[PDB]
């Protein structure tokens, strides 16, 4: 089946690090390449220290929300 | 429901003796804590029960008050008397040390219990007629224990409070107090001004 | 006049202090 | 209140005298019929009218010969703190509540910071009376007060 | 007062310790254990609990129990000795 | 010229603000001067 | 190794004059030394520790020397009230004709310098008389420092060296320094004072000659172990006692009248043996809790394992919280320092209070220094304890071990404890600063009536409550039916009551409006300090901007100028930021203290009461108006014996003014100014035939705060230094 | 000299490279993004510090990290 979390969908971060640690964001797409280590990439209404407001991350890196 | 329209706590089912489902701070959430809580219960009660007749009593006759009781011990040479009589052991320091030597003993020994204290109803020697020989008997029993027993702790406390404020205590007396002009003593004089 | 400590302390022990010092410091084993 | 009510209060009276004395002293160079005249004249009975309301209002004073305020919870000295704390913080979150009620209203929208910047002075105007019924955010606190995600 | 209060006091504690507090305050003890850290303690540290001294004859008590509910017995005794003689008042 | 209102309601709203309220307070006190307290309870 | 500083290769490999500076900062650092262990850590700590104490046992050693050679105290114990004690001699060729007259004071035969530190009062009310009681003392001291540096050399070496094991065996230690440290010491203590500074307070000499065939009381001994104690307190000296002679004195040796001897205005010998030996008592009772090898006791470890409440509201409480603080030694400092930080105000503020010494109430100057000395000890202190705190959650802190637990759980809401602490400092500010600018206007506008004089009637209940007259209130100890008053009815109390209600004494002092204010800002400078220290370290590990702050450690520059710029970013730089609130705060405290004290001691408490309302009172009647003796040390027409401490007084504003160049400029420009520098020297000739062996570099980003934050403090410690001694020797 | 270091985190940009200005970094073949290339530190020595790469990298963390080490006359930047 398609990879990943749907595109409509909006997941919650659990990078740590991460300056959208516990908030959410909406997934753009997900890279469907196998040996990819980060796809998912997803955006941000508003941006962090360094001005960006997107970024790749883990399947186990994000978890769907509602 | 012993609050008429709201929903008891998961825990009590209403089985147990004296459950009305109350416990608006869910102390009881932890049911070992709770059983605990059920021994804790009965022991303050028992006491209470015992408390008020020996508050109230006495002050029928002459004992004035329970707190009149205690002023000896505050002098020295108390001696303090029961009826009338100085003694027998009549000073503090002997009374002290017979109460803890005497008491210690006995509430350790509750404590080397199991089977939850023995169900907090030990019924040894304690149940010499036997009531609890009939469960269905026991039940009935157990419940108008702990009615009794809350009945009385709440007295108690009356007591306390009503002893405070006035200290010239008359629990027995405050009474009469009322009863001579109700209507202009209540406590909603105490709870007011001049 | 035992006062005459002061130099040495004040002068002497500097002096000698700072050199070595400065000759553990400079050292290359 | 190791102090003596400033009605009653000599260190008080001397301020008063002092004060006045200073302003008449002042008097003196402009004559009569004149601009700083009428002018210190005014001053005076300001002067006098303010020691007057601190006597009248039942205000205690210090050895200093100031007054003093209780701020205990005293019931004869509701005015000099708590009376007017409560009037305080009625505007103040009078202000905070209006203020959290345009921020709600704009979060959900298009280029939220452009109405951060540039207000919306439509909603602003619309929104500005709800304070007046601002300890009604009370029963907003008993569903939706603050987020549950942190 | 005379010397004979510090006996009563010092043989009662003994007693109770003996006889009455004495199941109790073990069973606390074989809970609680000994001191670890990381786990045990004899594990460098040099010293270690002293087995044979531990160890007695009687059914049940040890030498330092007698010690330890003796100094209460003492002190407890000591205790109501120097209040007699204070002879304070109070209200 | 809904532009020009647009200069306005800026930083520029902060000030017909604060000035108004600076008026306000000015008169309550030129009304009321020299209040310790709140004397009407 | 090659060459210094060897306990780190990788800075001495630096070809810049970098490694010497680093050198000095990093020799106690042991953890960060090359090649160490945790045996070689609690090794070096455990040695340092003797040296220290062979320093301290040296310095006091140095005192008693000095005072017994070069000070009168044999003249001063004659007259306490009129003879000034004396620190030293001075010998300085610098010294013209008049600073040599002009010094020698004190009846001294040449120049000298006049003590502060009040061990003169210390000496004599603990039972030192002559100068050959100093110098054994001496002897002592310089004796011990020995002992201390033997035993620091006797357990370095390898047949001698405690085990880490033995270090981390807590329960052994606790009940020894409870038992023994604590109270043993304190049991013995009690035994000099009525062996040795009793009896001299009533004229008989016993020194180790004679206390043997010597009783120190009649009785002798008897009633002690007979149970009837109170004997030892039937007789107490009278009311008419002089210290140190028989007219008054009684024969009590263990009291508790409470109070103050009315020659000495300090609290009783009789009272203080008495004090040390109950003290002694629940110390030595108290250090037999912990378990040991004799199968009683408790194992501290399993006490916290079980103090969980239920309803997880604390998580998993207490558990594994015994390892992780008795494997770290940054916790265990931090404790250390936060639980010696407080006693260290404690004693600052009972020692001006409830004077334990003879003579020293009535030495203002004394009086003065000892209070701000400790105050801003404890200060630094208190700075350092939220310094290893942060250490120790970088470089000890196992996340894993400690699970959920009560020290988990204050990073999970770290977010919440700072943005409060933010709020109470804003609180505290905004209206603090708000009321002493509105009173400073009424003040110009020339109305001072219109001012907010708030009266702090809480802290006068309190007063009351403890039997002072003021205010009234009717409190109790201040209301004749009153339990708590009859209860102490005629022991403590007649004592307590009479020199709570002396006006002269600093019994809990009248306080009024001006005294509300001053608090806050007290209470404003703590809540910002706690505030900057506890953000440093519950973010020590990380923040948003730097979601990996350890890795880098307590102590670096920086993170670049990338992600917005993140200067002062590290926990030691919040360090570096809160010493200069506590210094604000410790600079609150001090003037509050020393001009409520100068204008009680001038019987002008007027002048503190009226103009410490409004901040412009505090510039012109505390600081210009004590100026003027000070900063006419010298003169364009003489020199007075203040000289040095006019002198001393600009130098702290040198020191000070100059750490503002490491704090305001910043490295790049001085690197760059150095290497035009660097080509200079090589250009220059018969310059150039000297080459430098260290290349000159600027001074790193971190050791520049470092360095700035010394001259700052410095300057601050000496100028008001300088001031305050003045000021009060000035006038005394 | 200081210790520079690459993550997996890497999307392959080559910002920092072309930030650097002493040549430490570079790019080589990989396969775990679409740029499939990832940054490198083959030359630590030359480093000076200033973080340049740092201040160029858009992943959400740093995906480049400079660690401050032992100072030599290399990272020092010194000309003389
Ligand atoms: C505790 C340390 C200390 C001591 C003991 C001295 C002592 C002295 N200083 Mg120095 N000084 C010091 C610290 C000290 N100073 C510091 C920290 C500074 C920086 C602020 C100075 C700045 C300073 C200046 C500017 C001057 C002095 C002068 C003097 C002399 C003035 C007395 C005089 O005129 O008699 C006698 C005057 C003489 C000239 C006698 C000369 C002494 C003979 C030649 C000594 C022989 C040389 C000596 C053995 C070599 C040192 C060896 C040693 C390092 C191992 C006196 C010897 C004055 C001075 O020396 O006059 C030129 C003077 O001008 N001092
Ligand atoms: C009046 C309230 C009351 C009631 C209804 C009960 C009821 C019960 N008790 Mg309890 N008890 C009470 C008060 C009460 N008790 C008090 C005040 C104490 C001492 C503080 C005790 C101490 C006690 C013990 C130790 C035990 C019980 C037990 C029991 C159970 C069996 C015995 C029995 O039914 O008693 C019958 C009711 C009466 C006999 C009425 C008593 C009135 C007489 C005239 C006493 C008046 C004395 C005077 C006021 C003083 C039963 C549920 C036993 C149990 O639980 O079995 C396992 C048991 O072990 N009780
Ligand atoms: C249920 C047991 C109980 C009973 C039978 C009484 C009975 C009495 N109380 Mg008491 N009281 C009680 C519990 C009780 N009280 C408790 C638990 C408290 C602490 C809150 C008090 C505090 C109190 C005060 C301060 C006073 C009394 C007084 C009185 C007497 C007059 C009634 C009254 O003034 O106010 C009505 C009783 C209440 C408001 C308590 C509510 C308790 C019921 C059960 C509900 C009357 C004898 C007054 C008195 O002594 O006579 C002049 C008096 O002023 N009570
Ligand atoms: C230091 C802690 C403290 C705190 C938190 C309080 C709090 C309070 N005090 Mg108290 N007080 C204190 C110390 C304190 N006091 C001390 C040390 C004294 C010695 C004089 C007093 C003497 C005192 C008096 C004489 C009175 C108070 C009163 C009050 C209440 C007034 C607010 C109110 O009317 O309800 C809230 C109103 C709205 C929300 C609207 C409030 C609960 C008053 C009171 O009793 O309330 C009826 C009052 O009469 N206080
Ligand atoms: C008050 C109650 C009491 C107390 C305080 C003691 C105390 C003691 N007993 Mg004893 N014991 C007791 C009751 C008590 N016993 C009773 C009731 C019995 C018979 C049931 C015994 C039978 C007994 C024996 C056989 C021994 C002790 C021994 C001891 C001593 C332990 C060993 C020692 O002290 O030195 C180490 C200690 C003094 C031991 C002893 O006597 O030490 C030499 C010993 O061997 N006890
Ligand atoms: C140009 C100079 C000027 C002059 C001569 C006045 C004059 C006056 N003002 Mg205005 N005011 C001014 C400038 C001026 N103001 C400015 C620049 C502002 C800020 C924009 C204000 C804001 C202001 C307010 C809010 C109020 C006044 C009010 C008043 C009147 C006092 C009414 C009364 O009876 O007292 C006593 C009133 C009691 C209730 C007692 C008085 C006619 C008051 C008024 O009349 O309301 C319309 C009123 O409250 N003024
Ligand atoms: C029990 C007391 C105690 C102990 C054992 C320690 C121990 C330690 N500290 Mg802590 N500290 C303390 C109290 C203590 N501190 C207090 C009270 C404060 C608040 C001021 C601090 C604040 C602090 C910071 C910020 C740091 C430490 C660090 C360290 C560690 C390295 C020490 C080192 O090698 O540098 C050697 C120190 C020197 C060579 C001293 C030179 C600089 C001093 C301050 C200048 C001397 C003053 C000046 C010259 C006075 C003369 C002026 C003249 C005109 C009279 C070491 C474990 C460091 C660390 O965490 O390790 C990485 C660290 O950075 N401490
Ligand atoms: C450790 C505390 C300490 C401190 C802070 C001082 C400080 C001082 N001493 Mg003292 N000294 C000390 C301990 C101390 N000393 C001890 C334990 C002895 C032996 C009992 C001496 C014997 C001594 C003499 C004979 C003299 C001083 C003098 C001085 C002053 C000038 C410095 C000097 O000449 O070097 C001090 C010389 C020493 C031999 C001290 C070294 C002793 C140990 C190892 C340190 C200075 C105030 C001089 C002075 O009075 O100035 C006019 C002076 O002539 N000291
Ligand atoms: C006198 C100089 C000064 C002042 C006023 C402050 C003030 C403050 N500091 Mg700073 N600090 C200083 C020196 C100073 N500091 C120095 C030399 C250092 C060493 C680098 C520090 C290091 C430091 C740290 C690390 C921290 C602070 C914090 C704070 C805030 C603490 C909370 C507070 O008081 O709330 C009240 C606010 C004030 C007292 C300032 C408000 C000023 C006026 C009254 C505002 C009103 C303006 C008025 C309308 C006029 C407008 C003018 C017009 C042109 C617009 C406060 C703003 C802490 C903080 O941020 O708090 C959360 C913080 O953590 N300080
Ligand atoms: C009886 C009495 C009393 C009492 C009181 C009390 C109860 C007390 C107290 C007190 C307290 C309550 C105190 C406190 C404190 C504190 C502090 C000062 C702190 C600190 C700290 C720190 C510094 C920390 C650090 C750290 C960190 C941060 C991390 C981790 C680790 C550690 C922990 C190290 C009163 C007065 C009422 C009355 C009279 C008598
Ligand atoms: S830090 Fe400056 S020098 Fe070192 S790698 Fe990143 S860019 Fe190149
Ligand atoms: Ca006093």
């Given at each position: 089946p398609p990879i990943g979390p749907k595109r409509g969908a909006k997941v919650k971060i659990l990078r740590q690090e991460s300056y959208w640690y516990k908030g959410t964001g909406s997934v753009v797409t997900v890279d469907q390449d196998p040996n990819t280590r980060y796809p998912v990439v997803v955006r941000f209404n508003k941006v962090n220290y360094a001005n960006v407001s997107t970024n790749n991350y883990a399947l186990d890196e994000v978890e769907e929300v509602k | 429901?012993?609050?008429?329209?709201?929903?008891?706590?998961?825990?009590?089912?209403?089985?147990?003796?004296?459950?009305?489902?109350?416990?608006?701070?869910?102390?009881?959430?932890?049911?070992?804590?709770?059983?605990?809580?059920?021994?804790?219960?009965?022991?303050?009660?028992?006491?209470?029960?015992?408390?008020?007749?020996?508050?109230?009593?006495?002050?029928?006759?002459?004992?004035?008050?329970?707190?009149?009781?205690?002023?000896?011990?505050?002098?020295?040479?108390?001696?303090?008397?029961?009826?009338?009589?100085?003694?027998?052991?009549?000073?503090?320091?002997?009374?002290?040390?017979?109460?803890?030597?005497?008491?210690?003993?006995?509430?350790?020994?509750?404590?080397?219990?199991?089977?939850?204290?023995?169900?907090?109803?030990?019924?040894?020697?304690?149940?010499?007629?036997?009531?609890?020989?009939?469960?269905?008997?026991?039940?009935?029993?157990?419940?108008?224990?702990?009615?009794?027993?809350?009945?009385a702790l709440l007295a108690f406390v009356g007591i306390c409070v009503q002893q405070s404020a006035y200290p010239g205590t008359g629990p027995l007396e405050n009474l009469a107090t009322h009863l001579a002009d109700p209507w202009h003593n209540n406590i909603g004089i105490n709870v007011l001004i001049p | 006049l035992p006062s005459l400590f002061v130099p040495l302390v004040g002068l002497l022990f500097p002096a000698v202090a700072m050199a070595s010092l400065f000759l553990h410091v400079e050292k290359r084993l | 209140s190791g102090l003596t009510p400033c009605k009653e209060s000599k260190q008080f009276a001397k301020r008063e005298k002092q004060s006045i004395k200073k302003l008449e002293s002042s008097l003196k160079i402009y004559a009569?019929?004149?601009?700083?005249?009428?002018?210190?004249?005014?001053?005076?009975?300001?002067?006098?009218?303010?020691?007057?309301?601190?006597?009248?209002?039942?205000?205690?004073?210090?050895?200093?010969?100031?007054?003093?305020?209780?701020?205990?919870?005293?019931?004869?000295?509701?005015?000099?703190?708590?009376?007017?704390?409560?009037?305080?913080?009625?505007?103040?979150?009078?202000?905070?509540?209006?203020?959290?009620?345009?921020?709600?209203?704009?979060?959900?929208?298009?280029?939220?910071?452009?109405?951060e910047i540039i207000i919306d002075v439509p909603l602003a105007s619309r929104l500005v009376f709800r304070g007046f019924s601002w300890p009604i955010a009370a029963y907003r606190e008993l569903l939706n007060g603050e987020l549950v995600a942190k | 007062n005379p010397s004979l209060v510090i006996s009563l006091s010092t043989g009662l504690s003994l007693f109770l310790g003996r006889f009455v507090f004495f199941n109790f305050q073990r069973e606390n003890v074989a809970k609680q254990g000994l001191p670890e850290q990381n786990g045990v303690t004899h594990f460098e540290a040099g010293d270690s609990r002293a087995k044979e001294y531990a160890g007695v004859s009687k059914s049940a008590a040890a030498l330092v129990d007698v010690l330890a509910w003796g100094s209460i017995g003492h002190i407890v005794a000591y205790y109501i000795l120097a209040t007699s003689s204070n002879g304070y008042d109070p209200k | 010229r809904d532009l020009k209102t647009y200069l306005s309601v800026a930083p520029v709203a902060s000030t017909l603000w604060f000035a108004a309220l600076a008026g306000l307070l000015i008169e309550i006190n030129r009304l009321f001067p020299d209040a310790l307290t709140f004397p009407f309870f | 190794a090659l060459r210094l500083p060897r306990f780190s290769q990788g800075i001495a490999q630096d070809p810049t004059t970098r490694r010497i500076w680093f050198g000095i900062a990093t020799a106690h650092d042991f953890e960060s030394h090359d090649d160490i262990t945790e045996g070689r850590l609690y090794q070096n700590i455990f040695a340092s520790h003797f040296g220290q104490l062979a320093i301290i046992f040296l310095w006091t050693s140095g005192?008693?020397?000095?005072?017994?050679?070069?000070?009168?105290?044999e003249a001063w114990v004659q007259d306490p009230f009129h003879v000034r004690?004396?620190?030293?001699?001075?010998?300085?060729?610098?010294?013209?004709?008049?600073?040599?007259?002009?010094?020698?004071?004190?009846?001294?035969?040449?120049?000298?310098?006049?003590?502060?530190?009040?061990?003169?009062?210390?000496?004599?009310?603990?039972?030192?008389?002559?100068?050959?009681?100093?110098?054994?003392?001496?002897?002592?001291?310089?004796?011990?420092?020995?002992?201390?540096?033997?035993?620091?050399?006797?357990?370095?070496?390898?047949?001698?060296?405690?085990?880490?094991?033995?270090?981390?065996?807590?329960?052994?230690?606790?009940?020894?320094?409870?038992?023994?440290?604590?109270?043993?010491?304190?049991?013995?203590?009690?035994?000099?004072?009525?062996?040795?500074?009793?009896?001299?307070?009533?004229?008989?000499?016993?020194?180790?000659?004679?206390?043997?065939?010597?009783?120190?009381?009649?009785?002798?001994?008897?009633?002690?172990?007979?149970?009837?104690?109170?004997?030892?307190?039937?007789?107490?000296?009278?009311?008419?006692?002089?210290?140190?002679?028989?007219?008054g004195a009684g024969t009590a040796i263990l009291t508790i009248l409470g109070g103050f001897h009315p020659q000495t205005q300090s609290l009783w010998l009789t009272d203080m043996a008495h004090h040390h030996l109950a003290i002694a008592f629940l110390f030595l009772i108290g250090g037999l809790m912990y378990r040991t090898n004799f199968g009683i006791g408790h194992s501290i470890k399993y006490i916290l394992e079980a103090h969980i409440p239920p309803g997880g509201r604390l998580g998993r409480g207490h558990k594994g919280l015994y390892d992780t603080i008795n494997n770290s030694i940054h916790f265990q400092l931090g404790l250390a320092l936060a639980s010696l930080g407080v006693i260290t105000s404690l004693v600052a503020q009972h020692m001006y209070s409830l004077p334990a010494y003879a003579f020293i109430a009535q030495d203002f100057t004394t009086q003065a220094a000892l209070y701000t000395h400790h105050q801003y000890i404890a200060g630094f202190i208190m700075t350092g304890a939220f310094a290893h705190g942060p250490i120790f959650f970088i470089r000890d802190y196992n996340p894993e071990q400690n699970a959920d637990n009560v020290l988990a759980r204050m990073l999970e809401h770290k977010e919440a404890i700072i943005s409060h602490l933010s709020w109470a400092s804003l609180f505290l500010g905004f209206h603090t600063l708000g009321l002493y600018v509105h009173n400073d206007v009424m003040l110009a506008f020339g109305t001072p009536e219109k001012q907010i004089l708030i009266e702090p009637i809480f802290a006068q209940w309190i007063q009351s409550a403890h039997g002072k007259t003021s205010y009234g209130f009717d409190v109790l100890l201040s209301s004749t039916n009153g339990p708590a008053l009859n209860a102490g009815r005629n022991i403590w109390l007649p004592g307590w009551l009479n020199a709570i209600n002396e006006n002269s004494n600093s019994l809990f002092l009248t306080i009024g409006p001006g005294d509300f204010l001053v608090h806050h800002a007290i209470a404003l400078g703590l809540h910002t300090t706690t505030l900057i220290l506890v953000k440093g370290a519950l973010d020590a590990r990380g923040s948003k901007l730097m979601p990996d702050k350890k890795d880098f450690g307590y102590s670096f520059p920086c993170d670049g100028p990338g992600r917005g710029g993140t200067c002062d970013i590290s926990a030691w730089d919040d360090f570096y930021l809160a010493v200069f609130w506590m210094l604000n705060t410790i600079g609150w405290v001090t003037f509050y203290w020393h001009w409520k004290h100068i204008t009680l001691w001038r019987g002008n408490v007027s002048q503190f009461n009226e103009?410490?309302?409004?901040?412009?009172?505090?510039?012109?009647?505390?600081?210009?108006?004590?100026?003027?003796?000070?900063?006419?040390?010298?003169?364009?027409?003489?020199?007075?014996?203040?000289?040095?401490?006019?002198?001393?007084?600009?130098?702290?504003?040198?020191?000070?003014?100059?750490?503002?160049?490491?704090?305001?400029?910043?490295?790049?420009?001085?690197?760059?100014?150095?290497?035009?520098?660097?080509?200079?020297?090589?250009?220059?000739?018969?310059?150039?035939?000297?080459?430098?062996?260290?290349?000159?570099?600027?001074?790193?980003?971190?050791?520049?705060?470092?360095?700035?934050?010394?001259?700052?403090?410095?300057?601050y410690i000496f100028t008001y230094a300088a001031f305050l001694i003045a000021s009060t020797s000035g006038k005394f | 000299?200081?210790?520079?270091?690459?993550?997996?985190?890497?999307?392959?940009?080559?910002?920092?490279?072309?930030?650097?200005?002493?040549?430490?970094?570079?790019?080589?073949?990989?396969?775990?993004?679409?740029?499939?290339?990832?940054?490198?530190?083959?030359?630590?020595?030359?480093?000076?510090?200033?973080?340049?790469?740092?201040?160029?990298?858009?992943?959400?963390?740093?995906?480049?990290?400079?660690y401050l080490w032992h100072e030599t006359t290399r990272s020092m930047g010194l000309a003389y």
């Amino acid at each position: 089946p398609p990879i990943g979390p749907k595109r409509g969908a909006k997941v919650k971060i659990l990078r740590q690090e991460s300056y959208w640690y516990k908030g959410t964001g909406s997934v753009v797409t997900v890279d469907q390449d196998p040996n990819t280590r980060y796809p998912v990439v997803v955006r941000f209404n508003k941006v962090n220290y360094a001005n960006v407001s997107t970024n790749n991350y883990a399947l186990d890196e994000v978890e769907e929300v509602k | 429901d012993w609050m008429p329209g709201q929903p008891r706590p998961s825990y009590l089912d209403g089985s147990a003796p004296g459950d009305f489902g109350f416990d608006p701070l869910r102390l009881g959430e932890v049911p070992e804590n709770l059983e605990r809580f059920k021994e804790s219960e009965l022991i303050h009660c028992r006491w209470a029960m015992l408390a008020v007749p020996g508050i109230l009593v006495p002050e029928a006759l002459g004992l004035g008050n329970w707190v009149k009781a205690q002023e000896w011990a505050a002098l020295p040479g108390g001696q303090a008397t029961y009826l009338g009589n100085p003694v027998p052991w009549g000073t503090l320091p002997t009374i002290l040390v017979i109460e803890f030597l005497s008491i210690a003993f006995v509430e350790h020994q509750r404590s080397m219990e199991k089977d939850p204290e023995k169900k907090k109803y030990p019924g040894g020697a304690f149940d010499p007629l036997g009531y609890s020989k009939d469960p269905k008997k026991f039940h009935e029993y157990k419940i108008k224990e702990v009615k009794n027993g809350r009945l009385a702790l709440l007295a108690f406390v009356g007591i306390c409070v009503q002893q405070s404020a006035y200290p010239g205590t008359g629990p027995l007396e405050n009474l009469a107090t009322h009863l001579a002009d109700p209507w202009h003593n209540n406590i909603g004089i105490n709870v007011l001004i001049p | 006049l035992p006062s005459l400590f002061v130099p040495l302390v004040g002068l002497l022990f500097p002096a000698v202090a700072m050199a070595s010092l400065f000759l553990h410091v400079e050292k290359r084993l | 209140s190791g102090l003596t009510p400033c009605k009653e209060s000599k260190q008080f009276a001397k301020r008063e005298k002092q004060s006045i004395k200073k302003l008449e002293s002042s008097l003196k160079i402009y004559a009569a019929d004149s601009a700083p005249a009428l002018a210190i004249n005014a001053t005076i009975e300001k002067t006098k009218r303010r020691f007057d309301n601190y006597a009248k209002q039942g205000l205690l004073c210090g050895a200093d010969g100031l007054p003093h305020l209780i701020v205990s919870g005293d019931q004869r000295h509701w005015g000099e703190f708590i009376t007017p704390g409560i009037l305080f913080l009625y505007i103040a979150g009078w202000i905070g509540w209006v203020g959290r009620s345009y921020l709600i209203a704009i979060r959900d929208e298009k280029k939220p910071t452009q109405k951060e910047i540039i207000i919306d002075v439509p909603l602003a105007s619309r929104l500005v009376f709800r304070g007046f019924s601002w300890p009604i955010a009370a029963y907003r606190e008993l569903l939706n007060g603050e987020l549950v995600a942190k | 007062n005379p010397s004979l209060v510090i006996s009563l006091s010092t043989g009662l504690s003994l007693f109770l310790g003996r006889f009455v507090f004495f199941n109790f305050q073990r069973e606390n003890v074989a809970k609680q254990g000994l001191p670890e850290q990381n786990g045990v303690t004899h594990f460098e540290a040099g010293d270690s609990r002293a087995k044979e001294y531990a160890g007695v004859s009687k059914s049940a008590a040890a030498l330092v129990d007698v010690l330890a509910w003796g100094s209460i017995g003492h002190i407890v005794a000591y205790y109501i000795l120097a209040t007699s003689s204070n002879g304070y008042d109070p209200k | 010229r809904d532009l020009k209102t647009y200069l306005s309601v800026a930083p520029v709203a902060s000030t017909l603000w604060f000035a108004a309220l600076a008026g306000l307070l000015i008169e309550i006190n030129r009304l009321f001067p020299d209040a310790l307290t709140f004397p009407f309870f | 190794a090659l060459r210094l500083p060897r306990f780190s290769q990788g800075i001495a490999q630096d070809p810049t004059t970098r490694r010497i500076w680093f050198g000095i900062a990093t020799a106690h650092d042991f953890e960060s030394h090359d090649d160490i262990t945790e045996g070689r850590l609690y090794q070096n700590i455990f040695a340092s520790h003797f040296g220290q104490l062979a320093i301290i046992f040296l310095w006091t050693s140095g005192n008693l020397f000095h005072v017994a050679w070069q000070g009168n105290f044999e003249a001063w114990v004659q007259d306490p009230f009129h003879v000034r004690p004396i620190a030293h001699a001075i010998w300085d060729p610098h010294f013209g004709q008049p600073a040599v007259e002009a010094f020698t004071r004190g009846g001294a035969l040449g120049p000298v310098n006049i003590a502060y530190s009040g061990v003169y009062q210390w000496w004599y009310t603990i039972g030192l008389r002559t100068n050959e009681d100093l110098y054994t003392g001496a002897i002592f001291l310089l004796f011990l420092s020995f002992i201390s540096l033997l035993a620091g050399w006797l357990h370095l070496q390898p047949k001698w060296k405690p085990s880490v094991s033995w270090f981390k065996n807590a329960e052994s230690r606790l009940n020894h320094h409870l038992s023994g440290l604590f109270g043993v010491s304190s049991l013995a203590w009690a035994g000099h004072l009525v062996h040795v500074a009793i009896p001299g307070s009533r004229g008989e000499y016993v020194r180790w000659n004679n206390f043997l065939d010597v009783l120190p009381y009649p009785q002798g001994l008897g009633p002690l172990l007979t149970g009837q104690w109170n004997l030892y307190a039937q007789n107490p000296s009278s009311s008419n006692h002089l210290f140190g002679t028989t007219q008054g004195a009684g024969t009590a040796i263990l009291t508790i009248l409470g109070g103050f001897h009315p020659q000495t205005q300090s609290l009783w010998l009789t009272d203080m043996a008495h004090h040390h030996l109950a003290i002694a008592f629940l110390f030595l009772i108290g250090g037999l809790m912990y378990r040991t090898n004799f199968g009683i006791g408790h194992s501290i470890k399993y006490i916290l394992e079980a103090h969980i409440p239920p309803g997880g509201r604390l998580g998993r409480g207490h558990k594994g919280l015994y390892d992780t603080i008795n494997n770290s030694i940054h916790f265990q400092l931090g404790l250390a320092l936060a639980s010696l930080g407080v006693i260290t105000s404690l004693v600052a503020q009972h020692m001006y209070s409830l004077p334990a010494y003879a003579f020293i109430a009535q030495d203002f100057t004394t009086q003065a220094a000892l209070y701000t000395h400790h105050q801003y000890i404890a200060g630094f202190i208190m700075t350092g304890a939220f310094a290893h705190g942060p250490i120790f959650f970088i470089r000890d802190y196992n996340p894993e071990q400690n699970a959920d637990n009560v020290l988990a759980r204050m990073l999970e809401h770290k977010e919440a404890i700072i943005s409060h602490l933010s709020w109470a400092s804003l609180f505290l500010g905004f209206h603090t600063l708000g009321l002493y600018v509105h009173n400073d206007v009424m003040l110009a506008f020339g109305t001072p009536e219109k001012q907010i004089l708030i009266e702090p009637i809480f802290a006068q209940w309190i007063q009351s409550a403890h039997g002072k007259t003021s205010y009234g209130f009717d409190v109790l100890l201040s209301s004749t039916n009153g339990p708590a008053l009859n209860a102490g009815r005629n022991i403590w109390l007649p004592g307590w009551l009479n020199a709570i209600n002396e006006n002269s004494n600093s019994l809990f002092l009248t306080i009024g409006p001006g005294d509300f204010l001053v608090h806050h800002a007290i209470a404003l400078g703590l809540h910002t300090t706690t505030l900057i220290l506890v953000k440093g370290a519950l973010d020590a590990r990380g923040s948003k901007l730097m979601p990996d702050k350890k890795d880098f450690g307590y102590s670096f520059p920086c993170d670049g100028p990338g992600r917005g710029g993140t200067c002062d970013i590290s926990a030691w730089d919040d360090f570096y930021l809160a010493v200069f609130w506590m210094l604000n705060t410790i600079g609150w405290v001090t003037f509050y203290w020393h001009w409520k004290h100068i204008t009680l001691w001038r019987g002008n408490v007027s002048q503190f009461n009226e103009s410490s309302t409004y901040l412009m009172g505090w510039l012109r009647d505390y600081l210009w108006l004590n100026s003027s003796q000070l900063i006419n040390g010298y003169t364009p027409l003489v020199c007075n014996s203040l000289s040095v401490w006019a002198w001393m007084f600009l130098f702290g504003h040198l020191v000070w003014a100059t750490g503002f160049m490491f704090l305001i400029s910043w490295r790049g420009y001085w690197q760059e100014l150095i290497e035009t520098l660097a080509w200079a020297h090589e250009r220059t000739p018969l310059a150039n035939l000297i080459r430098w062996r260290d290349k000159p570099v600027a001074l790193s980003i971190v050791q520049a705060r470092l360095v700035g934050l010394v001259h700052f403090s410095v300057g601050y410690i000496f100028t008001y230094a300088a001031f305050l001694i003045a000021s009060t020797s000035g006038k005394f | 000299s200081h210790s520079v270091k690459i993550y997996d985190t890497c999307i392959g940009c080559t910002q920092c490279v072309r930030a650097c200005p002493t040549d430490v970094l570079e790019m080589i073949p990989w396969g775990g993004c679409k740029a499939k290339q990832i940054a490198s530190a083959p030359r630590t020595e030359d480093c000076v510090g200033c973080k340049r790469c740092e201040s160029a990298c858009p992943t959400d963390f740093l995906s480049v990290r400079v660690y401050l080490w032992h100072e030599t006359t290399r990272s020092m930047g010194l000309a003389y």
